[PDB]
């Protein structure tokens, strides 16, 4: 109903925070962040890539398969007859 008032009931939690001025926009964003980028990227790339392979394969597979099938009329039947 009333959005902030009545949602849940919660007791004996404590919270701490600072003025945004009190702290920095990039607390080692570069150094400390780069590992975090890496670690989780693999958890996905396990389950992400495998299909993308398949298309590109088939993509070229059919591409070639398409090409010679079309490209060369005197391929199987050459122009002796």
């Amino acid at each position: 109903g009333r959005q902030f008032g009545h949602l849940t009931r919660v007791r004996h939690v404590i919270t701490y925070s600072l003025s945004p001025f009190e702290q920095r926009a990039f607390p080692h964003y570069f150094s400390k962040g780069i590992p975090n980028v890496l670690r989780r990227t693999r958890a996905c790339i396990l389950r992400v890539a495998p299909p993308f392979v398949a298309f590109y394969l088939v993509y070229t597979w059919g591409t070639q398969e398409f090409e010679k099938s079309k490209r060369k009329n005197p391929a199987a039947y050459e122009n002796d007859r």
């Binding site: 060369k72 122009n79 007859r81």
Partner: protein, 67 residues
């Protein structure tokens, strides 16, 4: 006169192997055709092949060669 840069740049790439290499195929076609040309055979298909990579070389060169 002026002979153009083109005809020159024409020759520099046709000098390359795959050019003359397939140019043989043209004759491999052509000569066989010359006897057998009664049948449907034509070397056009190969001509394009011949000319394709041919001017792929000719690409970069003459545009510089021109004004």
């Amino acid at each position: 006169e002026l002979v153009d840069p083109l005809t020159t740049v024409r020759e520099q790439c046709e000098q390359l192997e795959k050019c003359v290499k397939a140019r043989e195929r043209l004759e491999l076609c052509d000569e066989r055709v010359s006897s057998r040309s009664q049948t449907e055979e034509d070397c056009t298909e190969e001509l394009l092949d011949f000319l394709h990579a041919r001017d792929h070389c000719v690409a970069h060169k003459l545009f510089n060669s021109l004004k």
